[PDB]
């Protein structure tokens, strides 16, 4: 998968299940998903005053136990 495809996916402009799959199983694409969504949040002003970068890891660790 290319990052350009990742870019299209986060915009709802492709909904290809193979791409969603690759994303879910590709660490580098996961980082890009995270980075691009941080950029979106920043631009839209959808951030708290202090950003915490461990939220998703904490959430998933709690999911793994339940």
């Amino acid at each position: 998968m290319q990052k350009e495809q990742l870019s299209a996916l986060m915009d709802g402009e492709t909904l290809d299940s193979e791409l969603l799959n690759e994303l879910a199983h590709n660490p580098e694409m996961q980082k890009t998903w995270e980075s691009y969504h941080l950029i979106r949040d920043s631009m839209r002003g959808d951030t708290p005053e202090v950003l915490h970068f461990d939220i998703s890891s904490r959430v998933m660790a709690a999911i793994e136990e339940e």
Partner: protein, 181 residues
């Protein structure tokens, strides 16, 4: 700033409902700062991570019940708001001596008694945007600030949808280079 973005959420939500936790992780990454921003309007900063955490867990658990009657984000935010508000109720029912404790525990006692400012990030992002070529600036602006689809952006910039896709990507890559360190 979107609705077509809702399309991705729906597809992800459908997988989570089937047991796909990897798909949930994607949703959490997508919504983590938005949810924190919302929660931070109601609880003290020190409690924001715990409340955000509890909100996501509550959402995960109740996801069997999301029927797609409304947009997923709205459903998630209502959960986060309710979660937060409940936290405020618990705190607002503190006894007499809880404030006295806070007062006495506040000052440091001799002897011995992951983070970034969002405005800082916002300055970096907008400075980068201002340095991009007009074509990329407009592209990512129309998409992220106005919420326009690639088809709409294409008509506005009179260019192929493939070109819109590429312009938004390159803008993002430029910004990421200055942000993702």
């Amino acid at each position: 700033s979107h609705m077509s973005e809702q399309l991705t959420d729906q597809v992800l939500v459908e997988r989570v409902q089937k047991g796909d936790q990897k798909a949930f992780n994607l949703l959490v990454v997508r919504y983590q700062h938005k949810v924190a921003s919302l929660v931070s309007r109601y609880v003290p900063s020190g409690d924001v991570p715990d409340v955000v955490q509890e909100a996501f867990i509550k959402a995960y658990r109740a996801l069997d019940s999301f029927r797609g009657d409304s947009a997923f984000y709205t459903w998630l935010y209502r959960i986060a708001v309710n979660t937060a508000k409940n936290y405020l109720v618990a705190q607002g029912r503190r006894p007499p001596s809880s404030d006295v404790d806070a007062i006495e525990a506040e000052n440091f006692e001799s002897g011995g008694a992951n983070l970034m400012l969002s405005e800082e990030l916002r300055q970096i992002v907008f400075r980068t945007i201002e340095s991009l070529p007009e074509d990329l600036r407009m592209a990512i602006t129309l998409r992220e600030l106005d919420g326009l689809s690639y088809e709409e952006i294409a008509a506005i910039m009179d260019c192929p949808v493939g070109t819109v896709r590429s312009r938004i990507f390159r803008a993002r890559e430029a910004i990421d280079n200055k942000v993702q360190p």
